[PDB]
């Protein structure tokens, strides 16, 4: 599920395209998973051991990131394509 199905689920989803005017397009391409990480009150990442999750009533989960390519067309035969990495 993690290695293949998540990637295929994001990839086969329809690309978003919107208009009111400038056309906007959004596309999800690549997926990233870190290890299970805990953010403290200050917000510092640290590796979350599962025993800490058991004791502190946390959830032994890892964050999910996706590279999002936004392509905006301003009806002038130009396409500005900006790729946000690790969203």
């Amino acid at each position: 599920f993690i290695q293949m199905s998540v990637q295929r689920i994001v990839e086969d989803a329809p690309p978003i395209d919107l208009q009111a005017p400038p056309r906007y397009l959004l596309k999800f391409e690549q997926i990233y998973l870190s290890k299970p990480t805990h953010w403290e009150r200050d917000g510092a990442p640290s590796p979350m051991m599962p025993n800490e999750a058991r004791l502190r009533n946390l959830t032994y989960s890892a964050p999910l990131y996706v590279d999002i390519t936004k392509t905006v067309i301003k009806e002038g035969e130009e396409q500005l394509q900006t790729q946000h990495q690790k969203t």
């Binding site: 290695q3 990637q7 990233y32 870190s34 917000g43 990131y65 690790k86």
Partner: peptide, 16 residues
């Protein structure tokens, strides 16, 4: 396939 990221490549955006 899904790439793995080490903990050092996680920017401190979750705190901002």
């Amino acid at each position: 396939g899904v790439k793995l990221l080490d903990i050092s490549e996680l920017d401190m955006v979750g705190a901002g």
